[PDB]
Design a protein around this ligand. Structure first.
Ligand SMILES: Cc1cc(=O)nc(CCn2cc(-c3ccc4c(c3)OCCO4)nn2)[nH]1
Ligand SMILES: Cc1cc(=O)nc(CCn2cc(-c3ccc4c(c3)OCCO4)nn2)[nH]1
Lengths: 193, 193
């Protein structure tokens, strides 16, 4: 545990300053206070270290959403969506360097792409289930297929949060992105036609 | 012109089968019926060939949007947005291999990233201008800042169209993506609160 956790913490700290390609196994070993061959005991590559960091951040979001999902529904519909979107905002926003490196790795790592895809499918399925339950309650109109609406809104959040965190041009400023996403989710879920 | 256009057509044809990394200068030269050194006359790298292909596709979309933007406004608001989103759907959807390769290159090419960023900023600015004009006409409510709403909706379209064209998991099916995006644009622009 001890040495594994030091490698992960070292990697998260160095990713704040430079991309994974500019971080060496020696940097990771040195920061974790172990030798290079001892590193190779705990991980095969710096790529494996990033996969584990991303797995931890994604599971932290998923666990926080599970906590919310299994509590009573907020009776204010806008606040119910805002609290859930905020789990992603705070969780990924608290790990920007891992977020940035992980989104980059989706192009070069089938494991990173698979991890991201699995969790997106879960979050989309859960979004769709809540939309469906809102329609059954008569709170939301029967407009688009709930699963297709959930997919586009989750993909919006993926792209828009990422752009905000990375300060891309174009991007919504980070202090405006939650309100912007909640508006679009609430109008598109509750909006007639 | 002749030999430049053959190189571009060869490159677009080969990108339908394999990524740029798996295409050689010899493949491009051979398909364009020229020698390797003659290729280097027209382009420094296969990376430069992709930049030119992406520039052509992006300018084709931009010219088609300009054509629409300077014609009279469709008096049906849903149809006005649908026709504009459809320019991106048809244009990028007609050049999926260049779209896929270009989005991949944004990570490795500052020129590709700059080209994509410039055009996204233009399209977001134009979206925001139309929202603002709808609010001035009393057709749309004064909700979110128009430029922030435009940014999230354009980023949604970037991510969602890309995912559909690439058949990513998750994705909206290509036959459903236009209706899905138009619903979200129209409810979020015209929707009160
Ligand atoms: C089964 C059930 C029905 C119901 O109507 N309310 C709940 C609990 C309320 N709730 C909502 C969420 C939630 C809200 C927004 C989200 C989200 C989760 O994940 C993806 C991003 O958007 N988590 N818990 N549970
Ligand atoms: C200045 C003016 C005001 C007005 O209200 N109507 C027009 C013309 C109508 N129009 C709309 C668009 C259009 C619609 C949707 C779009 C889009 C363009 O680009 C980004 C994707 O979404 N192009 N032309 N012109």
């Amino acid at each position: 545990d001890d040495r594994e956790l030091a490698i992960l913490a070292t990697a998260e700290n160095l990713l704040e300053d430079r991309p994974l390609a500019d971080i060496s196994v020696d940097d990771l070993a040195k920061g974790a206070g172990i030798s290079r061959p001892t590193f190779y005991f705990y991980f095969p590559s710096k790529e494996a270290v990033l996969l584990t960091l991303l797995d931890r951040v994604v599971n932290q979001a998923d666990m926080a959403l599970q906590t919310l999902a299994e509590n009573p529904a907020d009776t204010d519909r806008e606040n119910m969506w805002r609290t859930g979107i905020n789990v992603f905002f705070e969780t990924f926003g608290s790990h920007k360097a891992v977020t940035r490196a992980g989104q980059a790795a989706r192009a070069t790592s089938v494991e990173v792409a698979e991890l991201w895809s699995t969790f997106m499918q879960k979050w989309i399925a859960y979004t769709a289930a809540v939309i469906d339950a809102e329609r059954d309650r008569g709170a939301a109109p029967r407009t688009l297929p709930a699963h297709e609406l959930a997919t586009a809104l989750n993909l919006m959040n993926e792209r828009t949060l990422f752009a905000s965190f990375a300060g891309e041009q174009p991007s919504v400023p980070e202090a405006r992105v939650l309100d912007t996403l909640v508006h679009i989710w609430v109008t598109s879920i509750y909006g007639e036609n």
